[PDB]
Each structure stands twice: as C-alpha cells, then as structure tokens.
C-alpha cells in the first residue's frame, strides 16, 4: 500500500546446481559454495551451520521428490519468524 516504511518479510532466494545438489561431493561445486556463501553472513537466521542445515535438506528434498524445480525452506529457528529461504534448483 502507500505505507512504504518497512516489509518485516524477508524472501531469500538460494541458487542450487541441479546436477551437483543431486550427487555426492557436492561441496566440491563452487556455484554450490559461493551462493550459499553469498548467503551466509547476513542471513537473518545462522549463517554457515544454516547452510549446511539447507543444503542437506534441499539434498533430500530433491532426491526423495527428483521431478521439482525450487523449494521454500523455514528456518529452523521458526522463532525468527517473517523470513524464508527459497531455493531455486538451476540446471547448469
């Protein structure tokens, strides 16, 4: 509305490597590490122990449902609340 003070709302959107978070060794992927990394210390939630929390479930996420495009992650400390993760899954 014509209110533009502050959107305590905040949408994170992560790139992951199709390929590389749908294989072991996928620390290994510099797309991988860098967009996380371009997340990670200013994120709202954690930082680094978030990434680790999100590329595992994002890992599994895709392995057990493969047939996806992108996935919107809750924090684990729901108590942050107005913040989400969206990963994107990107075919490189």
């Not at 502050?6 to 992560?14: F, G, L, Q, R, Y």
């Not at 930082?47 to 992650?73: D, F, Q, S, T």
């Not at 809750?74 to 075919?91: T, Y």
Request: some cysteine.
């Amino acid at each position: 509305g014509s209110a533009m003070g502050h959107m305590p709302a905040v949408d994170v959107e992560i790139h992951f490597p199709l390929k590389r978070i749908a294989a072991e060794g996928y620390a290994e992927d510099e797309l991988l590490l860098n967009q996380m990394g371009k997340v990670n210390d200013t994120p709202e939630e954690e930082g680094m122990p978030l990434r680790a929390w999100v590329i595992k479930c994002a890992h599994e996420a895709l392995e057990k449902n493969p047939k996806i495009r992108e996935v919107y992650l809750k924090p684990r400390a729901v108590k942050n609340s107005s913040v989400q993760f969206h990963v994107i899954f990107d075919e490189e």
